[PDB]
UniProtKB/Swiss-Prot annotation, chains A, B:
Function noted in UniProt: Probable nuclease member of antiviral defense system retron Eco8, composed of an reverse transcriptase (RT), this nuclease and a non-coding RNA (ncRNA) encoded between them. Expression of retron Eco8 confers protection against bacteriophages T4, T6, T7 and SECphi4, SECphi6 and SECphi18. At multiplicity of infection (MOI) of 0.02 cultures slow growth when infected with SECphi4 but do not collapse, at MOI 2 cultures collapse. When the retron is cloned in another E.coli strain synthesizes msDNA (a branched RNA linked by a 2',5'-phosphodiester bond to a single-stranded DNA).
UniProt-annotated binding residues for ATP: N33, V34, G35, K36, S37
Protein name: Retron Eco8 OLD nuclease
Family assignment from sequence similarity: Belongs to the class 1 OLD nuclease family.
Subunit-structure text: Homodimer.
Impact when changing K36A: No longer protects against SECphi6 infection
Annotated region described as ATPase domain N-terminus, given as residue ranges: 1-150
Swiss-Prot record, chains C, D:
Source organism per UniProt: Escherichia coli
Known role: Reverse transcriptase (RT) component of antiviral defense system retron Eco8, composed of this RT, the following endonuclease and a non-coding RNA (ncRNA) encoded between them. Expression of retron Eco8 confers protection against bacteriophages T4, T6, T7 and SECphi4, SECphi6 and SECphi18. At multiplicity of infection (MOI) of 0.02 cultures slow growth when infected with SECphi4 but do not collapse, at MOI 2 cultures collapse. Responsible for synthesis of msDNA (a branched molecule with RNA linked by a 2',5'-phosphodiester bond to ssDNA).
EC identifiers of the protein: 2.7.7.49
Taxonomic classification: Bacteria, Pseudomonadati, Pseudomonadota, Gammaproteobacteria, Enterobacterales
GO biological process: defense response to virus
This protein's name: Retron Eco8 reverse transcriptase
Keyword Magnesium appears in the UniProt entry: yes
An annotated Gene Ontology molecular function: metal ion binding
Amino acid sequence: MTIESIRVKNLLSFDDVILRDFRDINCIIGRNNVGKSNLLKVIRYFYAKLENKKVIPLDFHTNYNAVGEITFTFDTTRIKKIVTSRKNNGRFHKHIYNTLFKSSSVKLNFEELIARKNSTNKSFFSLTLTICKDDSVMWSVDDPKVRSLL
Amino acid sequence: MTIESIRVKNLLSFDDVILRDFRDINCIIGRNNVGKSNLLKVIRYFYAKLENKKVIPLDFHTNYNAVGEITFTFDTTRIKKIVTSRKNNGRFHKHIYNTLFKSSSVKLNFEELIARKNSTNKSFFSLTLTICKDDSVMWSVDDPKVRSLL
Amino acid sequence: KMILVDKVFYEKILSVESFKENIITQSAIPKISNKEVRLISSGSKIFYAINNTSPHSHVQLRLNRFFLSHIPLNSAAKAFVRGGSYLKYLEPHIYGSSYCRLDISSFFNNISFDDVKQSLSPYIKDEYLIGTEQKLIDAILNSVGYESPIRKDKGMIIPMGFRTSPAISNIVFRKMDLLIQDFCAKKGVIYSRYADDMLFSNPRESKLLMSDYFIDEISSLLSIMGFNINQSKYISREKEISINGYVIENKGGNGSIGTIRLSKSKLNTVLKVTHALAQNIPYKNICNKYIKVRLKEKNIKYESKKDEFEKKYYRDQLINYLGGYRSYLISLVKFHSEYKCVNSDFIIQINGILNDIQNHIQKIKKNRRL
Amino acid sequence: KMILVDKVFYEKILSVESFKENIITQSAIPKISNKEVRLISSGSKIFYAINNTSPHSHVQLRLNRFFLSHIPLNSAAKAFVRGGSYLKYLEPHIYGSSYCRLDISSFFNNISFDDVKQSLSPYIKDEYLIGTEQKLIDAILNSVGYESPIRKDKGMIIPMGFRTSPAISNIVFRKMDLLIQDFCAKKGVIYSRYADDMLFSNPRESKLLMSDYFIDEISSLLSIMGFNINQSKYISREKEISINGYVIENKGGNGSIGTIRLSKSKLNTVLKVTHALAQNIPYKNICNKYIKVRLKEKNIKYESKKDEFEKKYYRDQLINYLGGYRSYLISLVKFHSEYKCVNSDFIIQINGILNDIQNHIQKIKKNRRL
RNA sequence: GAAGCUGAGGCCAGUUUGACUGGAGGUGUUCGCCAUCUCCCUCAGUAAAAACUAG
DNA sequence: CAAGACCAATCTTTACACTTGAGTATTAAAGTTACCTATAGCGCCAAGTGCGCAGTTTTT
DNA sequence: CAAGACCAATCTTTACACTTGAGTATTAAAGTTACCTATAGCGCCAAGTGCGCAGTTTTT
RNA sequence: GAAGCUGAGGCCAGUUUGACUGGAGGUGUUCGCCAUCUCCCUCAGUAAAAACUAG
């Protein structure tokens, strides 16, 4: 897969919405703009803030919360299979390992590293964008290199 | 007068610019867009944030400062003369006094109130908009009624 | 549209018949007297129970049903709210790498009635209910409030065990929910609250939740409305926390998702019960030894039959317990299936335990007919 | 474009001729030895002065002129910066209603040389200046650094009185300038700094600057690079503050502009000098009693004439003092005219004082020719 | 360990049989020598940066 | 004593290596960078024109 | 013990009063608000269809 | 004053000539009874809300 989940909390017309189990073709139907255009706006805003574009923050569904969160879970299993292999010693694979997969495999010990390698594992990378009440934006990963690579 | 001063610190192409002594006709000349359009953008942004419009924050002149400030000094001498008089007991004059001129005359004692009344005084109201590094905006006066009335 | 209860709303929908006499005779609705309130003692805690026959119970229940349920709340409050649960209270912290857990000392006893009046005032019309003697808001507060005879110093007190105490606590604490949520979010910390138990998690790599500064700041925020932090229950840990049995673990760093499982302490009682049922030790011993449920002789409804009555009651208690624990574990399973945050090996263990429970329940229901 | 000094830059523009021998012979540039440094004692403070004849003085002066002046700084640093002044350090606080003033204990003595190297590293190329023995950055730090023979424990130390110490202090403290500026601005407080003296002002109506929390937070921020707050110089006040003579006052609340004046303590010496000059007390007594300037007998340049020399020297000292104080007061007047923040009655008093000073200066210059 | 801070002495006043502490008053005040009005000598030693030379 | 919050650049943008479709241990070359600067009042020297290198306040 | 940070609405938008151009002590009417709701499983009663009002875990 | 917290008793073990403290072990660990693997009785008294009835 490519995207495991998208979660929006307290933004536009979304109270707490989680979308997952994405298939190869996703057909969106229903009454017009009851959240279709809102979901599109959420995704576009997240991907505009990913590339450090200065875009206006989204509105809150209810002002009785201080923040609104958009969480994207990327499925990086295939990229881990791409880079962890010995053959591909290229610069791009090396950079991808140093950025996305390090600082998560460093903490592990030998036994857990072996268990992760040998098992039919699935690897995920979760990135959360939080909008505070005063228009500030906070990421759950503070490295801009990670955001640009994603 | 109407506006006593406009001060911009660390925004767009402005390092620390103070404009004052405004006359009835102000002619702006010089090399094109060396700060003309930037001054217009600053004024438009301040007046859009005054009315609680969601507009994009301005860029910093240099990122070695945490904030950029726009200070507007309004000349409210005539409005004080308008409202402090006894004859005009209308609702609008009463609201203007309760919003703009109270909380600044309450602290005063009788002698200083008399001195302010009798002297050929000039009254000013200073409002500062501060943009932090994380796009947040802070006002030097936290009452939205003051901003809307201004 | 914000809810607004006025005199007609109280007369028709809320009072109905409970206070018809007091509203037609223009007599002030009185305080909840000590006669209507019984005082149970549970350890060091004291619980206040109102009699159902009193009109105060009816008006309180209808107040919960129609008025308190419509006032908006903060999303960080996961307790006593429509759709909230403990698992929902733990879920947002799977993304965190360090965990901190704080408690509020005597949450319900420290809720000042003045704060309750200030919180409920905008949602109640400023009218006079009875002539010019008693206000509508004061009558409703009479419905919700109480004076503890044990402690007359505080006067008005919101007691535990009433109909309306939890929801009123949530509404009055929405202010601190907002303040703490704003502070934590500006610090990058995920915050959630269940009753008086606050959980914070930092997903980044930092010692913020371990410093005394964080505790000092949360105490400073709580001090605005007079609350205090229970320092005996303050917990701070890295990479895993065992909160009252529920274990959250997240070893990874950037972009890692933790797992929520149950420690062996939680599973201890149910595993022992299943083993005892496999051991064919009688139902009376199973109920008494592990579940602490028993049929007191003074609680026998009828003297027509005793031994068969006790056998049926113990069988009912066992079937009820097994159904309840099965329901709890499927609550966990559904939470996993909808959020995908529970450990996979723990999921397998849960499935095995569930199959064992269902086999035992089938055996019990089959032996019922023999 | 960020400045970048490389080997050719050091050889041509900086070293010039001061270290020609050391650069052609490939011999390492040596530390500033104790022979080149004299130690003056001013109260409890010790000042380090390098001899002008040493090449270290020349390279330090050219380092100030060409390299340190190009590295960007933070706008909150109003000291030792092109265009900065004390009045500019006080000005942004006229809008504040409460004031707080903090000091850093031994600012220059607590500047670790490791922090200096880390700060200056990105602006200096990572090359080898002399073979593979000494690096360019290490040679420049040799130029700027020193080891105090009084305190050998700290090794490298930036001493007061050197050519490059103030600018290097500003560059190394830019990090804390940014951190404190961000914190104060997120709290709504106007912050400015002059050397080690930090001034904060809150324009809103709040007790933030008076609580111990603010001092604790500023101390916590300063602790990152090892600084400490001088608790003897901590000041907090409302509606006016008298900072070292300069008085800021702002009684009003929402949208009020304060006034900066000078207390009578600052004007005391100049008023007394003007009164003494009007009293026709001789110039020697005026210089000795109030100004503490005197001509020591060992400082007589030539023995050809003494009494006329002493009269001319005292007249020169008096004319210089009057010109200097007049210059200070017109600095105040220009600051007012450009910012409009000085008290009007104080402006009138300044004008009268200035006219008196000019009349006295004209009288002195006229009596010179008699 | 919390440093508080100041250069070394020679009269005179206040506290001491024999040495230590200050050398306009008024007024208000956040009590800070903080603000505002009016009216002791000697000898050392004194680094650097920055602003300012009314209009 | 003791600690969370430990600048912003540093040239920038794009990007697979191996044997042609799948792959289980750690950045970089390259096109553009892409253009910079000696020496401002004082001293040396031709010898009074022209060229080379004794203040205030605040921190303290 | 002790404190800075003490929600977000509450209907909303516009706006001079006095005698027609200048003025030295404290909000509001009004048009739209502008539309809302009794009573969800259990008990009473017609008497088995229809109408009115003995669990788990967590806080504790 | 910092409360720490628990319902009241009746054996047996450990500390006490006469009354007080616990009733699987292993392993690791942030040492928290915290996590993971394997395998004492009686009598009181027990308010409210919320989730959950696999698939």
